[PDB]
Structure formats: structure tokens, C-alpha cells
mmCIF file with all atom_site columns, C-alpha atoms in Angstrom:
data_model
loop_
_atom_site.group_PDB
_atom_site.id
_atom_site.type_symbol
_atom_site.label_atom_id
_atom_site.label_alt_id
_atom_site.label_comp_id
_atom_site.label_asym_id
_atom_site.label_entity_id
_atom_site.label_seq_id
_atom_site.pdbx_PDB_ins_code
_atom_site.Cartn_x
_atom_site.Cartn_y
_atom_site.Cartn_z
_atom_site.occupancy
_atom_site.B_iso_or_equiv
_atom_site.pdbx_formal_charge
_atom_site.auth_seq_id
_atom_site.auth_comp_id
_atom_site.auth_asym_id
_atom_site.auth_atom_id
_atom_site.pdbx_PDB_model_num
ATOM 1   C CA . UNK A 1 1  ? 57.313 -116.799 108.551 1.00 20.56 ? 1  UNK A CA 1
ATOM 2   C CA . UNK A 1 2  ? 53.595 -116.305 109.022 1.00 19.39 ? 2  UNK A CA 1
ATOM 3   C CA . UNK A 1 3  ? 51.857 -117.514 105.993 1.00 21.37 ? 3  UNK A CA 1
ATOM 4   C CA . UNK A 1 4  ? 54.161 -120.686 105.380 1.00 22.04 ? 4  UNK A CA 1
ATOM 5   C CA . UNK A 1 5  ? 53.647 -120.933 108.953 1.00 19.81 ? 5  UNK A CA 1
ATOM 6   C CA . UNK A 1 6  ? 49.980 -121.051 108.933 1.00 21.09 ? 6  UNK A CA 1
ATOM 7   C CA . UNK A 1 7  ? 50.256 -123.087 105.882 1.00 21.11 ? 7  UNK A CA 1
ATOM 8   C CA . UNK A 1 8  ? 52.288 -125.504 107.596 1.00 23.10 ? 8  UNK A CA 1
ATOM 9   C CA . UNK A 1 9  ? 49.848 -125.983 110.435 1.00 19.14 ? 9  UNK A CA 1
ATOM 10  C CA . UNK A 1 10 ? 47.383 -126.205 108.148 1.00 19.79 ? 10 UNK A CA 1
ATOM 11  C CA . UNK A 1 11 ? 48.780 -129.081 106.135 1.00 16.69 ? 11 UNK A CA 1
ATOM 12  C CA . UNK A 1 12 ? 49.540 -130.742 110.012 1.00 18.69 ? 12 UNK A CA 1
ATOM 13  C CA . UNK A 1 13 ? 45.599 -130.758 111.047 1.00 20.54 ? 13 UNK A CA 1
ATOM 14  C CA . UNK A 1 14 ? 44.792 -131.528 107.327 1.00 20.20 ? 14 UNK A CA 1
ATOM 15  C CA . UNK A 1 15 ? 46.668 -134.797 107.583 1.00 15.92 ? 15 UNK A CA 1
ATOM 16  C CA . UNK A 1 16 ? 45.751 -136.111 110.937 1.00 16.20 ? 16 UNK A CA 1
ATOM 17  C CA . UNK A 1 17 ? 42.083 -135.409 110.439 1.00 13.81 ? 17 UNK A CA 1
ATOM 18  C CA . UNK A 1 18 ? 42.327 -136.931 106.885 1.00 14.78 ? 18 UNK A CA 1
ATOM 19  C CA . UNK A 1 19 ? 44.398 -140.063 107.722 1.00 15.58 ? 19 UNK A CA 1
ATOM 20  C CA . UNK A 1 20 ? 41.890 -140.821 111.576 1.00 16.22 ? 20 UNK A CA 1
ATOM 21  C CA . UNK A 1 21 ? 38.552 -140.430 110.028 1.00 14.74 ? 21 UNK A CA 1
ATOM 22  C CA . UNK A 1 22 ? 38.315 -142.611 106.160 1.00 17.01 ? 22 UNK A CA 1
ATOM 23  C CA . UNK A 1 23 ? 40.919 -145.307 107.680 1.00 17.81 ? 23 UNK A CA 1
ATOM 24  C CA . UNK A 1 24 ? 38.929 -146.350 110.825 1.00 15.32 ? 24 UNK A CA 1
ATOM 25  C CA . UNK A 1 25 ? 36.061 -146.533 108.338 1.00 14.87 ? 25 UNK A CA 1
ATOM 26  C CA . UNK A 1 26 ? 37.909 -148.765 106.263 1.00 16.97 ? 26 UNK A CA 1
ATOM 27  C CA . UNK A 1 27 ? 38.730 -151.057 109.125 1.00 15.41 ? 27 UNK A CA 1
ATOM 28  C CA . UNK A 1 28 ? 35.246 -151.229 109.849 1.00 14.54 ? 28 UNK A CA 1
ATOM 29  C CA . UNK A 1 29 ? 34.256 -152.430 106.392 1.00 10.26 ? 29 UNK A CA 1
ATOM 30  C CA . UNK A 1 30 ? 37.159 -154.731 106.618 1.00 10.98 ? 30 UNK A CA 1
ATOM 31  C CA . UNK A 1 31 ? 35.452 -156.414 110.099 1.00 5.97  ? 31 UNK A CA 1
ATOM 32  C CA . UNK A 1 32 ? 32.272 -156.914 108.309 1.00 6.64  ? 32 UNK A CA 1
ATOM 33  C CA . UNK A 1 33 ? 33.319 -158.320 104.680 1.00 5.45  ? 33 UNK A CA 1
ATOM 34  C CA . UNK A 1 34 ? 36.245 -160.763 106.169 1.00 4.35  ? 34 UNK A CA 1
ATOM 35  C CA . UNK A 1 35 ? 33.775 -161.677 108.628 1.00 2.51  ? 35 UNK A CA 1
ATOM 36  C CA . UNK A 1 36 ? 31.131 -162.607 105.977 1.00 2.10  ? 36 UNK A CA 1
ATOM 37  C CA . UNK A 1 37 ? 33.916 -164.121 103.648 1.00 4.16  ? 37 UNK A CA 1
ATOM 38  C CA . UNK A 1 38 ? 35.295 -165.933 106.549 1.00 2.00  ? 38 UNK A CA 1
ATOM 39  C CA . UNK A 1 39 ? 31.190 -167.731 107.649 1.00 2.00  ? 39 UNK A CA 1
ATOM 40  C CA . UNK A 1 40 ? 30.371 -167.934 103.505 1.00 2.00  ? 40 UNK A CA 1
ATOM 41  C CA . UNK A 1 41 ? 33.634 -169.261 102.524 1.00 2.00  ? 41 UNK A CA 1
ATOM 42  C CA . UNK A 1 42 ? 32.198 -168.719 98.632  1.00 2.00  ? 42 UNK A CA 1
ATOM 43  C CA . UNK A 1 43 ? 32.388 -165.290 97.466  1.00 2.00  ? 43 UNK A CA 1
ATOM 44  C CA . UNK A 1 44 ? 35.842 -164.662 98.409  1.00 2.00  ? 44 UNK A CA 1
ATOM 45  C CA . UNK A 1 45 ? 37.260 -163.429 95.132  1.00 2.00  ? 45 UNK A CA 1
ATOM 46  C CA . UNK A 1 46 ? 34.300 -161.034 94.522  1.00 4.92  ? 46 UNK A CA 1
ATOM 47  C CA . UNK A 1 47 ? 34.944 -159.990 98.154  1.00 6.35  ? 47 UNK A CA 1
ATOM 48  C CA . UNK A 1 48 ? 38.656 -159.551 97.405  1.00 3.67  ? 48 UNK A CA 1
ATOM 49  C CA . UNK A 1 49 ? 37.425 -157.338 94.882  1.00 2.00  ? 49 UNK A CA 1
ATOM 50  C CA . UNK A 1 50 ? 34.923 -155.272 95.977  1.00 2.00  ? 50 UNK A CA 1
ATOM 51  C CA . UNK A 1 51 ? 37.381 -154.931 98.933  1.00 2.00  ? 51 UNK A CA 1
ATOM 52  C CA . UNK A 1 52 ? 40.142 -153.473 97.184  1.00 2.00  ? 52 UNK A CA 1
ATOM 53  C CA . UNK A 1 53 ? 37.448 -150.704 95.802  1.00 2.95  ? 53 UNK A CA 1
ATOM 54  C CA . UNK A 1 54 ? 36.478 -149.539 99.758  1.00 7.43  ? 54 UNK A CA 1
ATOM 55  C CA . UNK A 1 55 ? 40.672 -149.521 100.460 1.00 6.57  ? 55 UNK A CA 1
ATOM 56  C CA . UNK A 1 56 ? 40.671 -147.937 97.208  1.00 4.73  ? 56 UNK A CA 1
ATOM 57  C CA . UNK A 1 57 ? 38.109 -145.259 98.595  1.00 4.65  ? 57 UNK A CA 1
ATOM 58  C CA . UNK A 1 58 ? 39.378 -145.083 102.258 1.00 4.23  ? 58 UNK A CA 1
ATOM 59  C CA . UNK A 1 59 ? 43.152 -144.912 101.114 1.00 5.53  ? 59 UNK A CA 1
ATOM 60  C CA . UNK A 1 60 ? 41.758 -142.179 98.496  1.00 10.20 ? 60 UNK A CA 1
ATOM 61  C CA . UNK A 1 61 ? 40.731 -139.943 100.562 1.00 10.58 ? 61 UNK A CA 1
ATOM 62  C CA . UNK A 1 62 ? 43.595 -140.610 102.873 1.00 9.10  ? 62 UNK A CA 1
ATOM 63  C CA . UNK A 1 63 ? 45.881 -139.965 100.377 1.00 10.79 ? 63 UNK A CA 1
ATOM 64  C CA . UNK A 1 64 ? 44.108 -136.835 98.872  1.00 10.20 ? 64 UNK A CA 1
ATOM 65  C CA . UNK A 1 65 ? 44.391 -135.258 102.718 1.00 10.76 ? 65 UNK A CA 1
ATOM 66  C CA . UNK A 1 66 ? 47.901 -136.390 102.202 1.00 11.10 ? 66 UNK A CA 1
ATOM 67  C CA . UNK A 1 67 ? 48.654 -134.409 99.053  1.00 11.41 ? 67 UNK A CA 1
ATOM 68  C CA . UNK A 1 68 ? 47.089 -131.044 100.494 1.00 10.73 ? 68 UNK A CA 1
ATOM 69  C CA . UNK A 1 69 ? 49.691 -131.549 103.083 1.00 8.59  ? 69 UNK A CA 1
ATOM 70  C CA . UNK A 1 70 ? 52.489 -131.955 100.937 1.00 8.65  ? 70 UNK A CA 1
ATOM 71  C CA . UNK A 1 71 ? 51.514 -129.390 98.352  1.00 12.10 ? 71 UNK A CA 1
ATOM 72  C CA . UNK A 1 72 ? 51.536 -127.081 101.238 1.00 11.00 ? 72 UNK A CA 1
ATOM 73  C CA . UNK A 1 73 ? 54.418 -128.472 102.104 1.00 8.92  ? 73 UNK A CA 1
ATOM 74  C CA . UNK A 1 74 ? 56.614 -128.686 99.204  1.00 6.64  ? 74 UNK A CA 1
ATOM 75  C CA . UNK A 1 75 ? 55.300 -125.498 96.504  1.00 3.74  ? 75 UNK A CA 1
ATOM 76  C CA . UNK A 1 76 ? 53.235 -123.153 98.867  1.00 3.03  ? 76 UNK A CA 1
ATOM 77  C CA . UNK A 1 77 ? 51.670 -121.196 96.400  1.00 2.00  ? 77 UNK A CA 1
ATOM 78  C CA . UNK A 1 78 ? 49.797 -119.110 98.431  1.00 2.00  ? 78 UNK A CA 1
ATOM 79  C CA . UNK A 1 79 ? 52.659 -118.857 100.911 1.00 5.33  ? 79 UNK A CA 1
ATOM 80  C CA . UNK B 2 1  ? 6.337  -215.513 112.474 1.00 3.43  ? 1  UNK B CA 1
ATOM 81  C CA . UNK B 2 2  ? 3.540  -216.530 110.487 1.00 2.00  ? 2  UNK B CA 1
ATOM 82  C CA . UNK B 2 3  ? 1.547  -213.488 112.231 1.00 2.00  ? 3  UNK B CA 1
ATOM 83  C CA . UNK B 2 4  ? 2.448  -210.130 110.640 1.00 2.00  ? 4  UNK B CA 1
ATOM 84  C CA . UNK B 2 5  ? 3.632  -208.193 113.466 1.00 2.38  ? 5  UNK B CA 1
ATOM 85  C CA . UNK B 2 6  ? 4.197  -204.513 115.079 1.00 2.13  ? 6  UNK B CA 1
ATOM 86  C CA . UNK B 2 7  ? 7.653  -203.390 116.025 1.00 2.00  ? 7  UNK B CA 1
ATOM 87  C CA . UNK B 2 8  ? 7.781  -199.330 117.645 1.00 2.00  ? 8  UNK B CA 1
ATOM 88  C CA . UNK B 2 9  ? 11.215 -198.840 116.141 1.00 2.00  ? 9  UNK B CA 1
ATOM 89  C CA . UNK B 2 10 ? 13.726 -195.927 117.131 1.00 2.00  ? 10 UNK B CA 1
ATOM 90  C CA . UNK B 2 11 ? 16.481 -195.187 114.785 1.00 2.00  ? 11 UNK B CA 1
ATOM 91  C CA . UNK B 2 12 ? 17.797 -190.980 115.837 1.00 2.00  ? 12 UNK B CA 1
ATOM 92  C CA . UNK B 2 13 ? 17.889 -188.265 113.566 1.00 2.18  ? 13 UNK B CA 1
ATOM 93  C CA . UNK B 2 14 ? 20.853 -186.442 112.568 1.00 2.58  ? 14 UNK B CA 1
ATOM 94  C CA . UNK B 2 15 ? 21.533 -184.380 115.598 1.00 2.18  ? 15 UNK B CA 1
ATOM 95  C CA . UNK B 2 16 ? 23.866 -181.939 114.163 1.00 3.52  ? 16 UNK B CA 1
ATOM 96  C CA . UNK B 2 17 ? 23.189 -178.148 114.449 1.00 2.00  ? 17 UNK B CA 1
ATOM 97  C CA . UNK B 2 18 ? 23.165 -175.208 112.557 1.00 2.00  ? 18 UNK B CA 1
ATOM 98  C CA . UNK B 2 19 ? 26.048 -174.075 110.744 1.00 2.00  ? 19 UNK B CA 1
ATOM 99  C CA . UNK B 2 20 ? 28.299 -171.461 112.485 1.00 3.43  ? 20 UNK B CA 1
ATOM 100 C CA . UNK B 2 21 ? 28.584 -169.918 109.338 1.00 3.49  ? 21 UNK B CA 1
ATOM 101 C CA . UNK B 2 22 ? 24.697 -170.375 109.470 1.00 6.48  ? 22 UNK B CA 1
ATOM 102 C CA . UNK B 2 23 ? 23.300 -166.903 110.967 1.00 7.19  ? 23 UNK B CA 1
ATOM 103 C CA . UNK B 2 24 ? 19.709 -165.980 112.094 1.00 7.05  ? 24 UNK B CA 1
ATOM 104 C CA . UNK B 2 25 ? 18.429 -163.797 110.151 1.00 9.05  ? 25 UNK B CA 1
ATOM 105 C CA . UNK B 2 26 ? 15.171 -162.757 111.471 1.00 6.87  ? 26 UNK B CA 1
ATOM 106 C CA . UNK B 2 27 ? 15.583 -163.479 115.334 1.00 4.60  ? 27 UNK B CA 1
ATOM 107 C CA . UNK B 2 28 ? 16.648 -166.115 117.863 1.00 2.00  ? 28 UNK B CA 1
ATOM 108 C CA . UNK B 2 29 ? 13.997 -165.205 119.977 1.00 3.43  ? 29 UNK B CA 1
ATOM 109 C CA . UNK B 2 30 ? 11.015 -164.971 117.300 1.00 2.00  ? 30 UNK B CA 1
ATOM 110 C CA . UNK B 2 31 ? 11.956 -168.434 115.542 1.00 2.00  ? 31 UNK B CA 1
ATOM 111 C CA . UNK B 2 32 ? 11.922 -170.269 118.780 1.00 2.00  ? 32 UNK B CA 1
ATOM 112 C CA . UNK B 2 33 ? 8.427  -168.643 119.148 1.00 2.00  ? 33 UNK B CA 1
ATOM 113 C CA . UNK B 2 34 ? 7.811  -169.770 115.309 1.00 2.00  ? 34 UNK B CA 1
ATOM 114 C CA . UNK B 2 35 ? 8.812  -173.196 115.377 1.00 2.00  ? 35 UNK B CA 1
ATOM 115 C CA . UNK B 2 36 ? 6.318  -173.716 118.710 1.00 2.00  ? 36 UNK B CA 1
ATOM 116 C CA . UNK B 2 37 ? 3.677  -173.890 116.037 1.00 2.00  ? 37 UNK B CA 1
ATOM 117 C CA . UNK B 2 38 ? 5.922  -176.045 113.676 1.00 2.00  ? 38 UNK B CA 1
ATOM 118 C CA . UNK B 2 39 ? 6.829  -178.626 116.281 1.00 2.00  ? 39 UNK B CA 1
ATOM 119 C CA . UNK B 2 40 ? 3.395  -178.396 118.041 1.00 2.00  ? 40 UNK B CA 1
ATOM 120 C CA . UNK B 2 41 ? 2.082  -179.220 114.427 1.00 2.00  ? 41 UNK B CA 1
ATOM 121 C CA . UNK B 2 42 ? 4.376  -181.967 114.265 1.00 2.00  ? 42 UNK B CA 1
ATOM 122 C CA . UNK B 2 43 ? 3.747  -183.906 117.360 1.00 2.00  ? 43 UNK B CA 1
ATOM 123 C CA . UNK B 2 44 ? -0.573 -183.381 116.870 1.00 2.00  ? 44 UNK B CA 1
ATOM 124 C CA . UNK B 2 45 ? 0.152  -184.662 113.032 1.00 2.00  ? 45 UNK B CA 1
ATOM 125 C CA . UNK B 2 46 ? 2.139  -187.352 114.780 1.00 2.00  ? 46 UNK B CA 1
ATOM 126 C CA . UNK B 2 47 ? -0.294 -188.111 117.848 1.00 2.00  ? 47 UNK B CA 1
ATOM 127 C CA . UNK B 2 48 ? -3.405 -188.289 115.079 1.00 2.00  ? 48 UNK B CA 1
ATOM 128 C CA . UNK B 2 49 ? -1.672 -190.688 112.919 1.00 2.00  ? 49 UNK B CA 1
ATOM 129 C CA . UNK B 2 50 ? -0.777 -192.752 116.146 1.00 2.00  ? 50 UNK B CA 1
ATOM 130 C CA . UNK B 2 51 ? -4.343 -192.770 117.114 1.00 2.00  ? 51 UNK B CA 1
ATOM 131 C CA . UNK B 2 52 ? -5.589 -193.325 113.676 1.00 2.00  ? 52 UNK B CA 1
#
């Protein structure tokens, strides 16, 4: 009950930090592309898709953060 | 009538702004200060040709 604890913790801080940081970065990319897809109505599929690569990034990292946590908390192999 | 004839007309130009999707890319501030020169230019262009 110390390692798994600390292990546990770990995963807890892992995920918060992870999941605040990379997502409030992606909602600031998401301000300035809608807002230049919204003015220049033209672009919008290219925006779409260039869009989906930055969630792609943001959420990736997110989700990476996410799987530490999980790995710590579902096979602890160092605890 | 059979004398040609001089006739200061007025028809208005389109007095629509900018786009809001239209953004200023340089400065508000600065192309004020540029077109000075432009419309300056215009009205002396205009004034010389009145003259003239």
C-alpha cells in the first residue's frame, strides 16, 4: 500500500495536468481558425481539416496523459 | 439648345464600407495616415483639372 499508492497519485496529477494544459490550447486554436473560417467563409473544408489535425494533437496528448494514468491504474508494473 | 452647354452633375458613389470579414492588416491608425496622401492627391488632381 505504498508503491500502488504513490503510483496512484501519480497517475491522479498525471491526468489533471495532462487533460488542463494541451485542451485549453486546443480551444485557443479553435477561437482563431472558426473565427477566420467564420470572416473568409472559403476555406472551410481545408479548415475542417487542418482542424481535426490540432484536436488530433491536443486530444493526443490528452489522451497519452490519459493512458499513463490508466496503465498505472490497471497493470502497475512497477507497483 | 443650339449652344453646347455645362452641367456640374452629382451622381454618389457607392457608400458601402469595408467588409466585416474585411480586416486591417497593417493598422487602422497608419492607413488613415496613408490615405491623407491618397485623398490629398485626389482632391489637388481634381482641383488642377477643375482649373485647367
Amino acid at each position: 500500500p505504498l508503491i500502488a499508492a504513490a503510483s496512484v497519485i501519480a497517475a491522479g496529477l498525471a491526468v489533471g495536468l495532462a487533460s488542463i494544459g494541451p485542451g485549453v490550447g486546443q480551444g485557443t486554436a479553435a477561437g482563431q481558425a472558426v473565427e477566420g473560417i467564420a470572416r473568409q467563409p472559403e476555406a472551410e473544408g481545408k479548415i475542417r481539416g487542418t482542424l481535426l489535425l490540432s484536436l488530433a494533437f491536443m486530444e493526443a496528448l490528452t489522451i497519452y496523459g490519459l493512458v499513463v494514468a490508466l496503465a498505472l491504474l490497471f497493470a502497475n508494473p512497477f507497483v | 439648345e443650339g449652344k453646347l452647354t455645362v452641367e456640374r452633375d452629382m451622381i454618389k458613389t457607392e457608400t458601402p464600407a469595408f467588409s466585416p470579414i474585411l480586416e486591417f492588416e497593417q493598422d487602422p491608425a497608419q492607413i488613415l495616415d496613408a490615405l491623407l496622401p491618397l485623398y490629398l492627391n485626389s482632391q489637388i488632381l481634381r482641383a488642377l483639372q477643375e482649373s485647367l
